[model samples]
Target: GRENLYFSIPTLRTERLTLRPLAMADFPAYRDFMASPRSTGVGGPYDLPSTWGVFCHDLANWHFFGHGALMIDLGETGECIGQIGINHGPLFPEKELGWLLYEGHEGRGYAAEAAVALRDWAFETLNLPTLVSYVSPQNRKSAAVAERIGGTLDPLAPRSDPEDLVYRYHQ
Candidate 1:
């Protein structure tokens, strides 16, 4: 059962968004988002080569950790609006609930909606006690999303970067 879990990817649905598996067709949008200044909160505005590394990392984590990234699609039109993931491995001290909205997709509550769905999925499927979101101190927008999805600022939580604010999510 555990071995099968590592290779399977599950799709999550929300009222207006579909959190589905990533596809090769999604790369251009992923690359553009990483290159844009909008990515600063996640340590980007990176170049193509570095962005490619991250893109590959996104999908690869699923094979290794049983959870990774999902492309967020608008349910009505099926437009790829953004991405979200439960991240792990060396950089993440705890499994993190991370998200990003494409250039035109902000201010719509999509991130919070999708985050709660994925966070709940992770807690149940992985049997995790908690998850976290490591938000840059300067990124209030993401802090808000983390809060909106029922995460509380965990001031003492361990983090990959010292400056990041750790938001902890409970089941």
Candidate 2:
């Protein structure tokens, strides 16, 4: 039998960002971000409705799996800027870190800072040996964040499915 793991809502902070549990109220803004071309990435499979499905799934995961995305907030104004956290599921037997920052929040290093903080929490509190992130070849910004967080590129990592050509990063 699977052991019962008691997980708590994790709030991670960096110099300029705050990562907190996401609430249902964030859906509209999250939906808006997902609709943007810059947020979805070039030729990505996700669209607005599809992204909404992800948001709902994350909320459910928090209730059932005990972990989900952290709603990234700006430290000064406490505004929701994006999301960063472990995307937990059966396909991801191990926690897979993922992040997305709205276009306006991009160039400020928020993703890297939030990702590093969350990864630290995952390692220290969750006692996870490794955390992985998958990035597309064209998504240079995410790749840079992976590098900044001490994640090494895995060129030969297996794809999640036949349609995905994304590369994996491991810490």
Candidate 3:
């Protein structure tokens, strides 16, 4: 019952942002965010609507697996700006922290702030010993958030063919 209950629901909020479970209802804005080449990457798979389905599946996975992304909303306006949370499974054997913010929401430090809060919650609530992030080498903005949250570059991990890099933050 614990597993079912936990996965079936979303987490609560922090002071600046409300961390709610993502749903298909958020897809329109999410679609727009992922449509931008700059938001994802030049020629990224996210540019296609089909790829957007995986994001929807990820939400279902969150409900099934007990861990996944949360839509991040400004506590004031309740507008969905982005998402930050941990996802669990084989591809990510360890709990992996991830984040994304819309183009217009950049430069505001929302990702870093939300991530730190989530990480703190993970450590305190779940008592997890480690959290990790895999970022595209070109994603310097996310890299900065990793750095600010005390994550370190993991050079030992195999680099992506295109040089995707992995970063880690541990308790």
* The candidate that achieves the highest lDDT relative to the unseen native structure: 1
RMSD of each: 4.9, 6.1, 5.3
Name the top TM-score candidate.
1
Clashing pairs in 3: none
- Model 2: per-residue Cα lDDT over 1-171, one tens digit each: 899799868777788887888787888888776776666453344677688778877666767666678899999577998888677776653467888887677788888888878777777776776667777666777777887788776656555654433434443
Report the lDDT tens digits of candidate 1 across residue range 53-94: 777878888999999999999995779999999888887898
Where in model 1 is the C-alpha error above 4 Å? 1-7
* TM-score of candidate 3 against the unseen true structure: 0.82
Residue 168 deviation, candidate 1, in Å? 0.4
Candidate 3, position 41, lDDT: 41
lDDT of each: 0.89, 0.72, 0.75
Candidate 3 local distance difference test against the native? 0.75
TM-score per model over all chains: 0.92, 0.81, 0.82
Higher-TM-score candidate among 1 and 2?
1
Error of 2 at 86 (Å): 0.4
